[PDB]
Structure formats: structure tokens, C-alpha cells
């Protein structure tokens, strides 16, 4: 009676956002230090889960 499951999962690595999705939650949500370029605005190449 002890059975098992087989669930399969999907993770996208390097997609890119559409035109009406490149925005921010606020003007100052996640801002790096002054005198440094934004590391976030580079295209993504990683994942974390």
C-alpha cells in the first residue's frame, strides 16, 4: 500500500522578458551602490531554487 509518485518539473534557464514586462516594482526597489552599474539589468544566465 506504500506507493510512489512520478512528478516531472520544468525550469527555464535563460529566457527574456517581453515588452510590457521590463519594469520595476518601485523606482527604488533593488538599487545597487552609487558609482556602480546595475548588475540586474544584464540579461539573465543563472537560476536559483
Amino acid at each position: 500500500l506504500v506507493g510512489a509518485m512520478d512528478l516531472t518539473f520544468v525550469l527555464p534557464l535563460g529566457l527574456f522578458n517581453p515588452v510590457m514586462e521590463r519594469f520595476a516594482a518601485h523606482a527604488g526597489d533593488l538599487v545597487p551602490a552609487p558609482g556602480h552599474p546595475d548588475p540586474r539589468a544584464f540579461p539573465p544566465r543563472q537560476l536559483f531554487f
Binding site: 512528478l7 520544468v10 525550469l11 527574456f16 514586462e21
Partner: protein, 49 residues
């Protein structure tokens, strides 16, 4: 076997933006300037995993 479709995880491409997804569904932001979140749709949703 029936549906031939797979389920997504709680995944993102910022380590920062992932930490919104531990409070709950209704308060985690999903996007950023070039980054994104994928919140799960699984039968692990109401579980402790």
C-alpha cells in the same frame, strides 16, 4: 502519463527575488527589470516540502 505535461517549481533568477516567495503566494513579486519568478503549480502546494 495521461496529460503529457509537467509542473513548475518555485524558481527565479535572482537570489534576492526568491526570498519574497517564502512569505506566501500573494505577496511575492514576480518580475524585475530583466529578471523573473516562476511560482509552483504542483500537488506540493499545500505541503511542507
Amino acid at each position: 502519463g495521461l496529460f503529457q505535461e509537467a509542473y513548475p517549481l518555485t524558481c527565479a533568477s535572482d537570489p534576492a527575488l526568491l526570498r519574497s516567495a517564502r512569505n506566501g503566494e500573494a505577496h511575492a513579486r514576480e518580475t524585475h527589470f530583466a529578471q523573473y519568478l516562476v511560482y509552483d503549480a504542483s500537488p506540493l502546494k499545500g505541503l511542507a516540502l
